[PDB]
Nucleic acid binder design. Structure first.
Ligand code: MG
Lengths: 85, 165, 63, 63, 255, 256, 63
RNA sequence: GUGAACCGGAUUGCCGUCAGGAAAUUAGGUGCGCUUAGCAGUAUUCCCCACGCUGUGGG
């Protein structure tokens, strides 16, 4: 709502959400550690956090340090995915 | 256990090209290749949503890559330290048998992100002896439960009792 | 150490030395009680130095 | 006044120290197996180091 | 009233206490074999030390010829199953001869363990044998905390330089003398996502979560490295990150 | 000294590659929001100069901005064209600093200035939604049989014409009727896009809702004549029809 | 997709599957030891020369 | 204060030293994704503010 259905890294129309930390999870979630993300960048984020040893604190799209390689990643999900469930 | 048997069934229902793109992804992670991550998402995300007892990400990825590489049928009562261990009775006990035993012994001292290569050489020893069946479901729920000592204990003495028959 | 150096010529030099001057001996091995696992970013010396720096900061802000 | 040296050293595949059966020395630390180098081996390597010929002045012999 | 100090100390591979045959001292608890440091070992390590040397102090803390010293320590029971190891040494002849090897060519014993160490002080009798010197008793209790925080058993340490520091100290002022050794009837099994000290402190936290259900507690970890209780529950009265402010809080509670 | 530029959209290439620009243009509110953010408030640039925060339109400023959606400069490349104008300085390096996949070529901007005379010919393209405010009988449910009440609903019906009239001179008569009010007079204009334009809108624990935005767009082109130069300066950057903020009011200042 | 010739049922196929292929520019490398070839044919030098020539022809003209 | 109180098992040390896993090997034979389509010749266009209700301030 406050993100206005807009992505946070590329400002595309958003359709899903992503978690920043798993200190609270399962059902107990409060809306200050969640980032509203679009379909094409949530997949990139999950592609990046799976084996980086991210433990609990996931990738934040709200700091400059973690962003510059997110675009380099999002370059090639467009490149190779078959659009055709 | 639910969530694991259907994972094995969906892996067994995979076609040849899908297994090929899993085979090429062997040896590395899934952040450098798209179709590996798309396939892991397709085979994990709906089964993760549908069941609470879905296996952990990295062990599921390891079993997916190993099943793509080796392709053994799922059969109950055919876990690793029974089949290997019955294989360990037909070897020369002074030189060859300690070497294969150390090859199986290495498996108890890895974490989950380098574990696929000693498993690969063990399953290669299995393939060289024409072993068609493996308890894939058993292997994956004992591999996802790797954090405890009793599970490795029953693993080990299952190898022992397979050896003493 | 001169072990099997003729067959394993491992003469690598240390990447980090901390020389501290104090009246009480400190073992930083408790930094590595949790084993160091590799990750995609950084290397093992960087991860170990980061863990050691975390423990050094904790000890200085502690004892 | 205590001088403390904490070093982090990454080594190539090697066998610097071995036990009776020719295996690298291992010790349990934090509940897990850790590769170990004996302190006596390090002391001998320091005493027989090239930076010690002008300083070595002791013999430990039975002959 | 009794001041109880439960210390968790992970020691690097060494041999702090030796029995007759050179093995690390070993006890039996939880239905498994544990590494043990004897009480008198820790007592003499805390005593006779310039870290602690800086009516008569330290005669009341540890007695000397019916003193009945206020401070006594329990045997350091490990939180996990003991893992004794053989170290094989040789001593070179360092004179060129026709043979090689000259020394004992023997074997030493060593073990690494996470010790639970219990300390108990009675305040009233510590004042009583100090002839009412309350300020001196507070200073010597602070000195006990300072020493036992940074003194190790001065056993075989030249070849095994184990100078690790405790990662957790719990100080309570409860009614009856209770030891939390029953917390570690479970030997600590190590998981991939947590370390040994975190699991031992968590076992302690899950055991003090009981007893109250069926007093206070000051918890010290260096810069809050290990919090007692990974929740917001009222389990530790004050999470303290530094040893000096821990000693200050304990002293201002007492007086 | 008006601010006329070009945003360039691919709308072509390999169909297998997901192209976010293609779904960006296939809705009104997406391009509206993206071009509305393209004039950020000045305090945000001092606070966050890197476009790296969850935005809020209250922090943004409001201006009657307007754009134009065209396409097809040929020469063996199908390409789509966005022509924007408003009154304040826009920024394109700030706006598309993470959206390089949106475009097919880097944007370019120059200084342009319009001039008008009395009785001078012009060439123009406009887009006005066909909107006629009418009282309608309500028509709901539609479960097998019609059900109406005496209430007359008020809305803007799309333009309809009699059966003995083609759409062409019907819209020509619309433009001829609207010309002397706005301040010009034409002799002929050509219809080349009559159709339907669809969109959706989100709005404020809350949820999100989808409703089909509806507009009967009419894009025309060709040969304009003016009656007075003073009746045209207040028309640019404001719009002449409806859906003004939605990109339906650009006066193509091409005197030829 | 393998299509059944007889339409005895609805418009199915038969067998459906994936074939995999690739296109590449290959670098091929061959090494022939002349003296080893001479020794292996027990000194028949003309046979070795014919073998080398036919190998050069067959490496190029046969896929 | 209870066979209890006071109470270290102390220190002296390189396993070391020799080593090619080595020679041999086509993954082949079989295969249509395919059958339907105006981005637009209109009859409610989802609306918040406003005209004697058909202009007017725009989401
Ligand atoms: Mg994005």
């Amino acid at each position: 709502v406050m993100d206005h259905a807009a992505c946070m890294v590329c400002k595309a129309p958003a359709t899903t959400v992503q978690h920043v930390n798993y200190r609270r999870a399962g059902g107990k979630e409060i809306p200050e550690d969640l980032r509203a993300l679009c379909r094409l960048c949530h997949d990139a984020c999950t592609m990046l956090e799976y084996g980086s040893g991210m433990t609990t604190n996931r990738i934040d799209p709200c700091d400059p340090i973690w962003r510059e390689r997110i675009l380099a990643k999002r370059k090639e999900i467009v490149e190779f995915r078959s659009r055709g469930r | 256990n639910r969530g694991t048997v259907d994972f094995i069934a969906s892996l067994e229902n995979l076609k040849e090209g899908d297994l090929g793109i899993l085979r090429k992804l062997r040896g590395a992670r899934l952040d450098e290749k798209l179709p590996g991550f798309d396939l892991f998402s397709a085979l994990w995300w709906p089964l993760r949503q549908k069941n609470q007892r879905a296996p952990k990400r990295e062990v599921a990825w390891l079993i997916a890559k190993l099943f793509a590489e080796f392709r053994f049928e799922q059969r109950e009562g055919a876990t690793l330290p029974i089949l290997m261990g019955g294989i360990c009775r037909k070897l020369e006990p002074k030189k060859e048998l300690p070497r294969v035993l150390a090859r199986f012994d290495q498996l108890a001292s890895l974490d989950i992100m380098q574990m696929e290569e000693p498993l690969s050489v063990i399953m290669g020893i299995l393939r060289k002896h024409q072993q068609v069946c493996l308890d894939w479901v058993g292997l994956t729920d004992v591999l996802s439960f790797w954090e405890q000592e009793p599970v490795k204990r029953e693993w080990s003495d299952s190898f022992i009792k397979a050896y003493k028959i | 150490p001169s072990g099997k150096q003729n067959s394993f010529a491992a003469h690598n030099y240390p990447d980090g030395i901390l020389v501290e001057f104090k009246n009480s001996p400190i073992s930083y091995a408790n930094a590595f009680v949790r084993p160091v696992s590799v990750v995609k970013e950084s290397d093992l010396v960087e991860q170990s130095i980061g863990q050691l720096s975390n423990y050094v900061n904790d000890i200085r802000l502690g004892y | 006044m205590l001088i403390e040296i904490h070093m982090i050293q990454n080594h190539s595949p090697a066998n610097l120290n071995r036990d009776d059966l020719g295996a690298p020395k291992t010790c349990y630390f934090g509940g897990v197996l850790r590769s170990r180098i004996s302190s006596q081996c390090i002391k001998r390597s320091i005493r027989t180091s090239n930076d010690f010929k002008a300083l070595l002045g002791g013999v430990r012999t039975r002959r | 009233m009794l001041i109880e100090i439960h210390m968790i100390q992970n020691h690097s591979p060494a041999n702090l206490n030796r029995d007759d045959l050179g093995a690390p001292k070993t006890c039996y608890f939880g239905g498994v074999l544990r590494s043990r440091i004897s009480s008198q070992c820790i007592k003499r390590s805390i005593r006779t030390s310039n870290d602690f040397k800086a009516l008569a102090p330290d005669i009341a803390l540890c007695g000397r010829m019916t003193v009945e010293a206020a401070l006594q320590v329990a045997h350091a029971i490990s939180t996990h199953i003991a893992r004794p190891e053989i170290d094989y040494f040789v001593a070179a002849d360092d004179v060129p001869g026709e043979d090689a090897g000259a020394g004992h060519i023997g074997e030493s014993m060593f073990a690494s363990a996470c010790f639970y160490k219990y300390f108990s002080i009675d305040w009233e009798q510590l004042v009583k044998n100090l002839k009412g010197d309350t300020n001196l008793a507070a200073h010597t209790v602070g000195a006990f905390l300072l020493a036992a925080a940074k003194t190790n058993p001065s056993g075989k340490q030249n070849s095994f330089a184990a100078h690790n520091y405790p990662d957790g100290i719990l100080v309570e002022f409860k009614n009856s003398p209770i030891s939390y050794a029953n917390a570690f009837v479970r030997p600590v099994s190590v998981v991939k996502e947590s370390d040994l000290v975190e699991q031992s402190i968590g076992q302690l936290s899950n055991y003090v979560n009981d007893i109250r259900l069926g007093v206070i507690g000051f918890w010290f970890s260096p810069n809050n490295r290990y919090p007692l209780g990974y929740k917001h529950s009222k389990l530790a009265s004050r999470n303290i990150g530094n040893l000096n402010e821990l000693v200050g809080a304990v002293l201002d509670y007492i007086g | 000294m008006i601010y006329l530029s070009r945003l360039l959209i691919d709308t072509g290439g390999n169909p297998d590659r997901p192209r976010p620009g293609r779904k960006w243009l296939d809705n009104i509110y997406n391009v509206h929001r993206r071009l509305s953010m393209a004039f950020p408030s000045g305090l945000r640039r001092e606070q966050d100069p890197h476009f790296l925060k969850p935005f809020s339109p209250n922090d943004f400023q409001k201006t009657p901005f307007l754009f134009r959606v065209d396409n097809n400069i040929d020469g063996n490349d199908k390409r789509a064209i966005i022509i924007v104008q408003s009154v304040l300085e826009p920024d394109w390096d700030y706006c598309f600093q993470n959206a390089l996949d949106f475009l097919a070529a880097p944007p370019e901007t120059k200084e342009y200035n319009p001039e008008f005379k009395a009785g001078q010919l012009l060439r123009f393209r406009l887009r006005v939604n066909a909107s006629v405010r009418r009282h309608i009988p309500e028509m709901v449910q539609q479960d097998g049989q019609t059900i109406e009440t005496g209430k007359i609903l008020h809305k803007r019906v799309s333009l309809t014409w009699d059966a003995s009239s083609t759409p062409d001179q019907a819209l020509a008569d619309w433009l001829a009727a609207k010309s002397p009010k706005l301040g010009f007079t034409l002799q002929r204009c050509e219809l080349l896009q009559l159709g339907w334009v669809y969109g959706s809108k989100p709005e404020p624990w809350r949820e999100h809702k989808y409703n089909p935005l509806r507009f009967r767009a009419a894009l025309l082109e060709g040969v304009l004549e003016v009656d007075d130069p003073k009746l045209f300066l207040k028309t640019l950057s404001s719009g002449i029809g409806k859906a003004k903020s939605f990109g339906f009011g650009l006066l193509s200042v091409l005197p030829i």
